Amino acid sequence: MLEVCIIGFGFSAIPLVRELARTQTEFQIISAESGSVWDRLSESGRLDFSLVSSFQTSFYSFDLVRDYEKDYYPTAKQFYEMHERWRSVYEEKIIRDFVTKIENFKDYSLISTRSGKTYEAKHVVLATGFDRLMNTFLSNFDNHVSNKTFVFDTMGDSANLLIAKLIPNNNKIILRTNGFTALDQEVQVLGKPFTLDQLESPNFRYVSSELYDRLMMSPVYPRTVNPAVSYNQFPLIRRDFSWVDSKSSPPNGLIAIKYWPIDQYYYHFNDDLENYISKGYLLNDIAMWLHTGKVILVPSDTPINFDKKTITYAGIERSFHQYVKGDAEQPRLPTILINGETPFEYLYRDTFMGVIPQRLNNIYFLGYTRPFTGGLANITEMQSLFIHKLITQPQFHQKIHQNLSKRITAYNQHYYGAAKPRKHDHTVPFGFYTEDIARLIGIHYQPNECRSVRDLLFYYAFPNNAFKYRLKGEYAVDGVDELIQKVNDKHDHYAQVFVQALSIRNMNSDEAAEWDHSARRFSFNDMRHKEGYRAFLDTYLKAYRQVENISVDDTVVDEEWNFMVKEACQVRDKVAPNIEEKTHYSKDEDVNKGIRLILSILDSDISSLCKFEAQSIEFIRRLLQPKNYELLFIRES
Ligand SMILES: Cc1cc2nc3c(=O)[nH]c(=O)nc-3n(C[C@H](O)[C@H](O)[C@H](O)COP(=O)(O)OP(=O)(O)OC[C@H]3O[C@@H](n4cnc5c(N)ncnc54)[C@H](O)[C@@H]3O)c2cc1C
Ligand SMILES: N[C@@H](Cc1c[nH]c2ccc(Br)cc12)C(=O)O
């Protein structure tokens, strides 16, 4: 009897196969000869973009311990080459066939394949990925189209990538929108660059869900009246968040687009633009597109005549060249039969942690949970440890399964409340999910075991990447000690993030929203740092066209478009003139002050510790006994 069968080998399965090989657990992989989108993109020479996720959250711990030297955003090519490197290590373990059906019984499954062969296995792991409509569109996109108008009914990372490829050829973009959430993928902290995933300090939720909400959600919800933020200059960007019913913020089910702000793009790539573009580093600053009018937002009910290919807005019947509507990703699951008779219906909220479907036995799903920020690696690495322990330790399997339905019910009450199941339920804050798995497995850290301020910085402020939980214990990886030390030294031990939570501890949500936007450059969608980059943008467009070997006529003035832009930016034109220079910027000052205190007490025992220093030490001491630490779905009762 085959112990483990893994169906699908791309990226999500790598960490599980590593752990199964380590324990010499019998396993067999079955993965299709076709491959993944990355294979198709590679064969067509379309790996010409970059990840929207940081290196430290997008590659696995056992690679980072060898290759991590700085924070950066990998290219699609680098990502695919890592997929291939690991495929080559385990190819001998891969049967190249396509699973068509899985018959599930009480203690084993019967696996059917297109070739006609059948397999039996006690444990079956699905890591088959998702089908996505936009994938084929990106695979067939002619990036030389020029001087055309495009209408988008959906916004997302894939749409934003297409928009980044259309903008340089003088194409005009109309977003027919009911809002979207976009976030600078890299931000300045006291002028220093930080990927957004580095500044989430998720474990502060344990201090207070309200405190963590104040600290995180002002860039998403319209909480500040600051005229420099994009959702006040372009109100059509605001989404209807009436569905949210959980007290855990950021809520499960929230999705965001991560993009290069032009000021950080300039900082990294200005000295070698053509090469960086050719490597896949494309400027996709949606806020800059709105600022310059190259993209406009129009109401969702703006009428479209699909026969005549026109859209009517601002009293203008505007011809358009192409309409783009993305679809919903759907899991690539084969037929699964409960008790070998009843077809299984996949529902994220009816699985535990996105991994254990409670209607099946010894079947696990790997790679179907999506991170709100950061790369999938954080999620699939922790899922792989979870699945590995379930497969190889019967006592853990029983501890989790004995009260499975009760665990799922408690999880859904905590993260979704009374909200009805949504399409995006499978999206989770990565620092909540990794910490949830760590506590289930037992490789978590305990806040009450911190002894020094430095220990508290590590517990609360050091990002909950998967490798954080692989320094000690059951799933320890050699070299993680040096990795953690390097990450700490290059991030000032995450004191700046720790200080943020400290600065807003006594504020309400409105006061926190204003404080988060009181910096000279606040983290997300700061419209004060766009106009100064118009000249660089022209330089960038010239470089992009040279790379793609296209000539574009930028002489013809599109008066019609200028008219539509003026209509679409009426609010911006009323709001932006209210921006005022200030003498002091509270967030910049409070952070600078806090960092000086923390580093002055870094190696001090927590028990040994004007007024700000006194009140801050008091808050720090309470961090040893957080009052919101309970997660009911962790218990076995
Ligand atoms: C355009 C795009 C950009 C992305 N950018 C990022 C990013 O910046 N950062 C990030 O972290 N993630 C990103 N992702 C997500 C993630 O990195 C990829 O989706 C990744 O390919 C998912 O890995 P996987 O192993 O789960 O799926 P896949 O890579 O699709 O692997 C699934 C494999 O299983 C095979 N298979 C499927 N069904 C069967 C079957 N029935 N029988 C046998 N074999 C089967 C498939 O052929 C394939 O080889 C992006 C995804 C897309 C589409
Ligand atoms: N106050 C934090 C907010 C923050 C930092 N990183 C984030 C990622 C997603 C979301 Br939503 C919010 C954040 C900051 O601006 O550094």
Side-chain angles (χ1 to χ4, degrees):
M1 171 59 97
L2 222 183
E3 188 69 12
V4 182
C5 184
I6 298 167
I7 301 169
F9 192 88
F11 164 78
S12 299
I14 294 165
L16 176 59
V17 165
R18 177 191 189 275
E19 296 307 310
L20 291 166
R22 176 179 64 77
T23 50
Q24 304 182 344
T25 306
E26 177 188 38
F27 70 94
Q28 181 69 236
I29 305 168
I30 304 173
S31 198
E33 186 77 325
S34 53
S36 72
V37 64
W38 302 99
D39 290 305
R40 302 185 298 97
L41 287 178
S42 179
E43 292 179 0
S44 49
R46 292 176 178 272
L47 289 176
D48 57 7
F49 58 103
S50 55
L51 305 187
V52 303
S53 50
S54 62
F55 182 47
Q56 64 278 8
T57 66
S58 308
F59 282 55
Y60 292 121
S61 65
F62 38 91
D63 278 334
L64 291 172
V65 297
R66 339 165 50 256
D67 298 336
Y68 176 83
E69 302 292 344
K70 78 176 178 177
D71 284 9
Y72 88 103
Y73 275 94
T75 68
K77 174 170 175 175
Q78 288 169 337
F79 198 50
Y80 175 65
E81 290 173 341
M82 174 265 293
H83 302 356
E84 283 293 290
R85 170 165 53 86
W86 282 114
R87 184 196 53 71
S88 306
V89 172
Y90 300 117
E91 184 64 34
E92 69 182 7
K93 301 289 287 178
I94 299 175
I95 293 165
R96 289 292 167 190
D97 203 351
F98 183 85
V99 170
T100 57
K101 183 168 68 173
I102 301 172
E103 300 173 70
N104 184 240
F105 309 98
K106 284 292 168 193
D107 48 7
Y108 77 105
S109 297
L110 183 64
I111 301 165
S112 300
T113 67
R114 189 177 287 159
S115 76
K117 300 180 291 175
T118 63
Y119 300 83
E120 295 171 8
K122 178 185 209 309
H123 296 277
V124 177
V125 179
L126 280 159
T128 54
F130 292 79
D131 285 318
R132 283 103 108 95
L133 174 56
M134 287 282 284
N135 286 350
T136 204
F137 190 86
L138 270 56
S139 294
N140 297 331
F141 174 67
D142 177 5
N143 78 292
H144 282 212
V145 63
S146 311
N147 294 293
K148 303 291 187 296
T149 296
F150 288 73
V151 175
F152 286 70
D153 262 358
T154 74
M155 188 53 179
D157 283 314
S158 287
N160 197 41
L161 175 57
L162 291 171
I163 291 170
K165 289 160 152 283
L166 293 169
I167 290 281
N169 300 348
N170 199 48
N171 297 295
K172 308 301 188 303
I173 308 295
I174 301 169
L175 276 47
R176 192 200 214 187
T177 186
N178 69 334
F180 60 88
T181 302
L183 296 169
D184 307 39
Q185 73 192 48
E186 210 187 65
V187 313
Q188 297 178 33
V189 312
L190 301 181
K192 309 183 187 187
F194 271 67
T195 66
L196 81 164
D197 52 290
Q198 300 283 280
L199 306 177
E200 307 193 13
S201 59
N203 287 343
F204 275 119
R205 65 160 165 171
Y206 293 147
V207 175
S208 155
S209 59
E210 296 84 1
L211 183 153
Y212 194 68
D213 180 89
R214 298 195 298 270
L215 182 61
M216 293 289 293
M217 297 310 294
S218 79
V220 171
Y221 301 148
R223 293 186 175 175
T224 185
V225 294
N226 193 310
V229 70
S230 68
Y231 61 55
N232 289 332
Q233 290 193 6
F234 297 91
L236 284 179
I237 217 167
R238 301 174 178 194
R239 289 198 57 78
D240 178 348
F241 290 111
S242 65
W243 58 267
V244 182
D245 189 58
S246 172
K247 268 51 64 173
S248 172
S249 299
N252 283 23
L254 181 69
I255 61 176
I257 293 133
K258 280 71 58 161
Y259 69 92
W260 278 112
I262 191 168
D263 62 351
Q264 296 306 113
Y265 188 99
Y266 176 87
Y267 170 78
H268 286 283
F269 310 121
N270 182 63
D271 292 331
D272 202 16
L273 262 183
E274 282 181 12
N275 269 315
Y276 282 120
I277 294 168
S278 72
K279 285 170 189 182
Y281 292 106
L282 308 178
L283 180 57
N284 55 354
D285 184 349
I286 182 64
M288 183 70 175
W289 307 157
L290 293 177
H291 178 78
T292 59
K294 294 176 184 295
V295 171
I296 63 176
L297 312 181
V298 300
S300 56
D301 72 329
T302 303
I304 290 175
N305 184 332
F306 286 98
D307 184 58
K308 305 302 190 184
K309 294 179 76 188
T310 71
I311 180 165
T312 299
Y313 174 79
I316 289 166
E317 191 166 5
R318 175 72 170 197
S319 294
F320 65 84
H321 177 73
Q322 171 142 45
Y323 169 84
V324 177
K325 191 187 206 72
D327 91 319
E329 70 198 331
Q330 296 297 333
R332 291 206 213 106
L333 297 179
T335 296
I336 299 166
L337 299 182
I338 296 162
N339 189 38
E341 302 174 322
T342 303
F344 167 78
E345 306 192 50
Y346 174 82
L347 192 271
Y348 186 82
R349 273 157 73 158
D350 200 43
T351 75
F352 186 50
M353 310 303 300
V355 170
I356 308 181
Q358 63 185 321
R359 311 185 91 84
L360 301 164
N361 305 121
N362 296 341
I363 289 176
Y364 319 92
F365 298 149
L366 172 57
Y368 304 88
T369 304
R370 177 72 219 165
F372 174 53
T373 66
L376 182 63
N378 272 334
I379 305 303
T380 51
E381 182 156 4
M382 296 304 292
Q383 287 187 335
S384 294
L385 306 187
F386 189 46
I387 296 170
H388 180 264
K389 196 173 185 168
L390 294 167
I391 286 174
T392 58
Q393 305 191 9
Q395 355 73 47
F396 185 69
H397 194 283
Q398 174 171 339
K399 180 168 50 271
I400 295 297
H401 281 81
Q402 66 188 19
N403 65 333
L404 188 66
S405 60
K406 290 172 56 181
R407 291 178 182 269
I408 291 163
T409 295
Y411 183 97
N412 291 344
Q413 289 175 340
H414 181 90
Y415 285 113
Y416 304 100
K420 342 308 266 66
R422 302 176 55 253
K423 189 165 93 294
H424 296 149
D425 279 339
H426 65 304
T427 307
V428 302
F430 83 87
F432 294 170
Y433 187 89
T434 60
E435 165 72 3
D436 289 352
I437 296 297
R439 287 176 65 168
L440 285 166
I441 293 169
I443 55 174
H444 64 291
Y445 298 88
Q446 300 204 332
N448 57 274
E449 291 182 356
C450 297
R451 163 271 231 198
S452 58
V453 170
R454 187 187 295 277
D455 292 335
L456 286 171
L457 292 174
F458 178 75
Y459 182 88
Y460 285 98
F462 193 103
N464 291 353
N465 300 322
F467 68 80
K468 185 180 184 183
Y469 303 101
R470 308 198 72 169
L471 172 65
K472 319 178 198 174
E474 182 171 18
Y475 287 107
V477 171
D478 200 355
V480 170
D481 61 341
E482 295 292 2
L483 177 55
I484 288 169
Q485 182 185 345
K486 222 182 266 169
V487 171
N488 264 324
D489 290 332
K490 290 179 192 300
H491 288 82
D492 297 337
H493 290 70
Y494 295 96
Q496 70 295 130
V497 200
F498 190 86
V499 163
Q500 276 195 75
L502 183 60
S503 300
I504 64 103
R505 56 168 153 52
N506 290 327
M507 296 176 185
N508 62 40
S509 57
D510 283 352
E511 294 171 334
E514 295 304 325
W515 179 91
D516 225 17
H517 293 81
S518 66
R520 290 190 162 280
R521 189 210 186 269
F522 46 79
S523 292
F524 307 112
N525 302 308
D526 193 331
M527 304 299 295
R528 296 170 292 180
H529 307 280
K530 308 295 172 188
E531 183 61 17
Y533 290 92
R534 271 188 188 271
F536 169 67
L537 180 50
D538 289 337
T539 292
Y540 169 85
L541 302 183
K542 294 189 190 69
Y544 185 97
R545 297 165 191 171
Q546 284 287 97
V547 173
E548 295 302 331
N549 292 295
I550 183 174
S551 49
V552 179
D553 187 359
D554 337 320
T555 70
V556 62
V557 176
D558 194 336
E559 290 296 0
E560 197 175 73
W561 181 256
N562 293 341
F563 189 92
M564 302 170 61
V565 170
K566 187 171 175 250
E567 176 76 14
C569 301
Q570 281 183 240
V571 172
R572 188 277 302 283
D573 288 335
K574 312 303 173 288
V575 159
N578 292 324
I579 294 168
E580 292 175 323
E581 194 75 7
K582 306 187 292 182
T583 49
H584 84 289
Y585 291 81
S586 296
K587 173 158 185 193
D588 295 325
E589 247 82 51
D590 287 356
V591 165
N592 222 73
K593 170 177 61 164
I595 292 154
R596 99 201 318 96
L597 167 54
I598 293 304
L599 290 20
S600 90
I601 67 186
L602 176 53
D603 288 325
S604 303
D605 295 338
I606 302 149
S607 65
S608 70
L609 303 6
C610 49
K611 215 71 285 175
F612 157 85
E613 293 102 334
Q615 238 197 145
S616 295
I617 288 13
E618 185 58 45
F619 179 82
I620 289 167
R621 294 169 85 87
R622 298 209 181 85
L623 292 178
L624 284 291
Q625 305 293 347
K627 303 301 188 183
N628 194 40
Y629 189 68
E630 178 72 11
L631 294 172
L632 296 167
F633 56 88
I634 306 291
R635 301 187 170 272
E636 70 187 303
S637 57

